[PDB]
Nucleic acid binder design. Structure first.
Ligand SMILES: Nc1nc2c(ncn2[C@@H]2O[C@H](COP(=O)(O)OP(=O)(O)CP(=O)(O)O)[C@@H](O)[C@H]2O)c(=O)[nH]1
Ligand code: MET
Lengths: 267, 470
RNA sequence: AGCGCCGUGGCGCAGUGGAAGCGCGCAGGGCUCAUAACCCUGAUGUCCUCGGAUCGAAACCGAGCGGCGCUACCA
C-alpha cells in the first residue's frame, strides 16, 4: 500500500513545486491528487491551468498522466489544496523532474521492501527513511553511501534486522551504477626506442590498478592514447588517471621524445 | 569430393610451398636468380604510369591478383596519395609443347614454388622465372612529388594510353620524360582501352603513339594491347617484362643505404598494447644487403626549430626487429626490393605521410644533411603534362632567386629557395633537411598555373652540411 | 579495426525503473451552407537477437545484429 508521504509531514507548504497525476476534470476545474506528497486532493482551476489560451483541456491535461505544478494556498484542518500550473518557470520543471525521480526511486525501493515483508509502509518509513532524510536531507544519497560506505546504518533502528538485511540486498541488487571516465593523451615521440616505452608505461599502469576498479590504457591512435576507467567511487579514478599521466611523463622525459595533452581526465 | 581449401593446400604442398630463407647464406656466391633469393624477395621493381581516370590498380590486379586499397573513403575512385602495391610472380611452363605466348602466367604473393599448369591439356608445372614488384604511381597534376618518388623506386615502367580519349596524352608524356630523367630506358607501352575500338581505330591509335615517340630518348619501348576488364593478354605483359627488362647491376660491394618512402605502424586498436609491435617504415633497397637484427638510423630525424630558428636534426637510431619482403618476415635482404623495415620506434613516427621520401642508413655510415646546396641543372623546350588547346605548348621560364621551387631529390620532397642562378648551375637553401650520399639524381618543379610542374633534371655537386647531434 | 550513438506505431525525438509515448502522419466523426483552420476517437509493433536480478524490464547489467561520427587501411 503506497501511502505515508515522502516528506516529514503529510501536508504541503506555501510556495513549493510539486508534480501531480490528474484523476478527473470538472467544469470549474480539476480536484486532483498530489504525488510529491501522499494522497491529499486539491483544485487546479482552468484559468490557472494552461499557459496559452485554454482552447482544449483534453490535449493539455491528459488525465492519468504526470504534470508539474505549484501550490498557492493550503487547508491545514482536514486537507485541501489550491494549486497552480501556468506559473511553472522553464527552470522549475527541471528541478521538479529530478526531485520526483529521486523520490520515485526511494519510494519504489521501500514499496518493494513493504511488499516482501507485508508490513505497512508507514512503520517502515518511520523506522528507516525519516532518520536518513533528517541526517542527509534525502535518503538516496544515504543509499549511495551504503553502496560505498556502510557506516550509514549505525544508530538507526529497523523494525527487525531481517528488514535491514533484505533492504541492503535490494540496494546491492537494484542501485548498481560506475562512471566511464575517459581521457586522451597526445603521443609525440619520435625517439629511438618507443614501443618498450609504452610497454613499461602500461606495465606500471596495471601495477597500481586496484582490485575494485580496473585500469586499462586503450590504443585508438598512435598519438591519441585513450584512458578509460570505471569510477565506482567517482572521486579516486581522477587520481588514478593523474598518477598514470605522471608515470607516462616520467617515461617520456628521458627517452628523447615528448608528449602532449588534449583531453585531461574528465567524466 | 574435397573442398577448395583442401585441394589448394594439397597443391601448395605438392608445389613446394613457401621455403624459409636460411639464416646465413654464403653471400658472395648468390645471384638474384638463386633459389634462396627468387623464392621470397622481389628482384625487379616495375611501376604503372598513366593519365587520370585510366586505371592502374585494375591492370595491376589483372596481372597479379593483389588489390590496392586506395583508402580515405574519398580517394577511393578519383586519385590516390600513397603507394598502391601488389605482388606478382611470373611463371613459365617447363614443357616445350606449351604455347610460348600463353605459357607465361602471373600469380599472387601467396603462391607456391611450382603451381600446376592451368592450361587445359598439358601436365607440366610452372617455374618462377623472376620475382617482381608492381607500384602504382598517382597520375594527377596535383600529385607530382609522389610520381617522382615512384620513379626513384621504379626500375621499370609501364605506360598506359587509352584509345577513345585524345591519342597524344600529356600526362603520359610527362611521366615518360620524368622516368627518362631517372635514367630508365626500359619502358613498355600498353593500350588501356581496346574493346570499344574498331579494327581501324586501334591501328590509328598505334600510329598516333608511334608518331608520339620519335624524337624522345625512348627507343625500343614495345606496344602491348591489354584490357583491364576481361583479364586477358596479361601473359603478354609478363612476357614483355621478362624479355625486355634486365636486372640492373646491384651486388654486395656497394654500401648499404635505403630509401624509405611510405609509413605504416603496427598498432592493433582495441587489443591490449602488451601484445603489440614497433613502428614500420616502407622503403626500397637501391644498394646494400640487410639482415634481421641490425641497427638503422633515419638521418633527417626529428627536425626541431630553436629559439633562433636553426634546424636541429636529431637522427633516429633504432634496432630492426623484423624485415618483411612481400610475403613473410625474412632474414636477409637482397638489393633492389621493397621492404617494410620494422623497429622499436614510437608509432607516431609511422602513422601518417611523414617518412615520405627520406633516406636511412646502417651503422658504420654517416650520411650528411644539407642546408645550402649547389646543383647543376638543365631544362627542356616544351612543358609536359599541360593541355594548351592548340596554342604553342608553354616553354619553361628561367629560374628566379628567392622563389619557392620544389626540388625533389630522387624522392625527397624539399622546398628550396634560390639564392643565385647562372647559365647552368644554381644554389638553393632547404628548409626541410635533405641528405646527400653519392649522386641522388634530382627533379625540379615550379608553380605558375596554381600547380606543380616538372621543368628539368638536376644533380648535386657541393653543399654546406650539418653534422648530426648526439 | 577502436569506441560514441541509434534501433518507432509510418517519419522525427524521448521516457527508463509498474507495460503501451508524443508531434507529424492516415481513417472516421464534429463545428461551417461549404473548404481549409480548429476540436474529438482510433488501428497499425517483436522501442535490434539471446540471458541474469527481481511480484516486475523495454528500462539496469551481460554475451552478439545492421547502419551511422571521429581514429584510421594501422606489415
Ligand atoms: N572499360 C574499361 N574500364 C577501365 C579500364 N581500365 C580501368 N577501367 C576503369 O577505370 C576506373 C578507375 O578506377 P581505378 O583504377 O580504381 O582508379 P585509379 O587508376 O587507381 C586512379 P590513378 O589512375 O590516378 O592512379 C575503374 O572503374 C576501372 O574499372 C579499361 O581498360 N576498360
Ligand atoms: C612498404 S614495403 C612493400 C609492400 C609490402 N611488402 C607489402 O606486401
Amino acid at each position: 500500500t503506497s501511502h505515508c508521504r515522502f516528506y516529514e509531514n503529510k501536508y504541503p507548504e506555501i510556495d513549493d513545486i510539486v508534480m501531480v497525476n490528474v484523476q478527473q476534470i470538472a467544469e470549474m476545474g480539476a480536484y486532483v491528487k498530489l504525488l510529491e506528497y501522499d494522497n491529499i486532493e486539491g483544485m487546479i482551476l482552468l484559468s490557472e491551468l494552461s499557459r496559452r489560451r485554454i482552447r482544449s483541456i483534453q490535449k493539455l491535461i491528459r488525465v492519468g498522466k504526470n504534470d508539474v505544478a505549484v501550490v498557492l494556498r493550503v487547508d491545514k484542518e482536514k486537507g485541501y489544496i489550491d494549486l497552480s500550473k501556468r506559473r511553472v518557470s522553464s527552470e522549475d520543471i527541471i528541478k521538479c523532474e529530478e526531485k520526483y525521480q529521486k523520490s520515485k526511486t526511494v519510494h519504489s525501493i521501500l514499496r518493494y521492501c513493504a511488499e516482501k515483508f507485508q508490513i505497512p509502509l508507514e512503520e517502515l518509513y518511520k523506522t528507516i527513511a525519516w532518520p536518513l532524510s533528517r541526517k542527509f536531507g534525502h535518503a538516496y544519497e544515504a543509499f549511495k553511501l551504503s553502496i560505498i560506505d556502510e557506516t550509514v546504518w549505525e544508530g538507526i533502528e529497523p523494525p527487525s534486522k531481517d528488514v535491514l538485511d533484505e533492504l541492503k540486498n535490494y540496494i546491492s541488487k537494484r542501485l548498481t551504477p560506475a562512471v566511464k571516465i575517459r581521457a586522451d593523451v597526445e603521443v609525440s615521440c619520435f625517439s629511438y626506442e618507443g614501443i618498450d616505452a609504452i610497454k613499461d608505461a602500461l606495465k606500471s599502469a596495471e601495477d597500481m590498478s586496484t582490485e575494485q576498479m580496473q585500469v586499462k590504457v586503450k590504443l585508438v591512435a598512435a598519438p591519441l592514447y585513450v584512458l578509460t576507467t570505471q569510477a565506482l567511487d567517482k572521486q579516486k579514478g581522477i587520481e588514478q588517471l593523474e598518477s598514470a599521466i605522471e608515470k607516462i611523463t616520467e617515461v617520456i622525459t628521458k627517452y628523447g621524445g615528448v608528449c602532449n595533452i588534449t583531453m585531461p581526465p574528465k567524466a | 569430393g574435397e573442398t577448395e581449401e583442401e585441394k589448394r593446400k594439397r597443391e601448395f604442398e605438392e608445389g613446394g610451398g613457401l621455403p624459409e630463407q636460411p639464416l646465413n647464406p654464403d653471400f658472395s656466391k648468390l645471384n638474384p636468380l638463386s633459389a634462396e633469393i627468387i623464392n621470397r624477395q622481389a628482384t625487379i621493381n616495375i611501376g604503372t604510369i598513366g593519365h587520370v581516370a585510366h586505371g592502374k590498380s585494375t591492370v595491376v590486379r589483372a596481372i597479379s591478383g593483389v588489390q590496392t586499397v586506395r583508402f580515405k573513403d574519398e580517394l577511393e575512385r578519383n586519385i590516390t596519395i600513397k603507394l598502391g602495391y601488389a605482388n606478382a610472380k611470373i611463371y613459365k611452363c617447363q614443357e616445350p609443347t606449351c604455347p610460348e605466348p600463353d605459357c607465361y602466367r602471373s600469380f599472387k604473393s601467396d603462391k607456391e614454388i611450382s603451381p600446376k599448369c592451368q592450361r587445359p591439356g598439358c601436365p607440366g608445372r610452372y617455374k618462377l622465372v623472376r620475382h617482381v614488384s608492381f607500384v602504382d604511381c598517382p597520375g594527377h597534376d596535383i600529385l607530382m612529388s609522389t610520381m617522382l618518388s615512384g620513379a626513384a623506386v621504379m626500375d621499370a615502367a609501364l605506360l598506359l594510353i587509352a584509345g577513345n580519349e585524345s591519342c597524344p596524352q600529356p600526362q603520359t608524356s610527362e611521366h615518360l620524360a620524368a622516368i627518362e630523367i631517372m635514367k630508365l630506358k626500359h619502358v613498355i607501352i600498353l593500350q588501356n582501352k581496346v574493346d570499344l575500338m574498331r579494327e581501324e581505330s586501334a591501328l590509328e591509335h598505334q600510329k598516333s603513339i608511334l608518331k608520339f615517340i620519335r624524337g624522345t630518348i625512348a627507343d625500343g619501348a614495345p606496344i602491348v594491347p591489354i584490357s583491364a576488364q576481361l583479364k586477358y593478354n596479361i601473359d603478354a605483359v609478363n612476357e614483355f617484362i621478362v624479355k625486355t627488362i634486365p636486372v640492373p647491376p646491384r651486388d654486395f660491394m656497394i654500401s648499404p643505404r635505403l630509401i624509405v618512402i611510405r609509413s605504416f605502424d603496427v598498432n592493433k586498436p582495441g587489443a591490449e598494447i602488451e601484445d603489440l609491435k614497433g613502428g614500420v617504415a616502407g622503403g626500397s633497397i637501391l644498394n646494400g644487403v640487410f639482415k634481421l637484427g641490425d641497427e638503422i638510423e633515419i638521418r633527417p630525424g626529428i627536425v626541431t626549430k630553436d629559439d633562433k630558428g636553426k634546424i636541429q636534426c636529431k637522427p633516429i637510431f633504432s634496432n630492426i626487429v623484423s624485415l618483411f619482403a612481400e610475403q613473410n618476415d625474412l632474414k636477409f635482404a637482397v638489393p633492389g626490393g621493397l621492404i617494410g623495415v620494422g623497429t622499436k620506434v614510437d608509432p607516431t613516427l609511422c602513422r601518417a605521410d611523414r617518412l615520405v621520401g627520406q633516406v636511412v642508413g646502417a651503422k658504420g655510415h654517416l650520411p650528411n644533411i644539407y642546408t645550402d646546396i649547389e646543383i647543376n641543372y638543365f631544362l627542356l623546350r616544351r612543358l609536359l603534362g599541360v593541355k594548351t588547346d592548340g596554342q604553342k605548348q608553354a616553354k619553361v621560364r628561367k629560374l628566379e632567386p628567392n622563389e619557392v621551387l620544389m626540388v625533389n631529390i630522387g624522392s625527397t620532397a624539399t622546398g628550396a629557395r634560390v639564392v643565385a642562378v647562372k647559365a647552368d648551375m644554381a644554389r638553393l637553401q632547404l628548409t626541410s633537411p635533405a641528405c646527400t650520399e653519392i649522386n641522388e639524381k634530382i627533379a625540379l618543379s615550379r608553380r605558375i598555373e596554381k600547380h606543380w610542374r616538372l621543368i628539368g633534371w638536376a644533380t648535386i655537386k657541393k653543399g654546406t652540411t650539418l653534422e648530426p647531434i648526439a
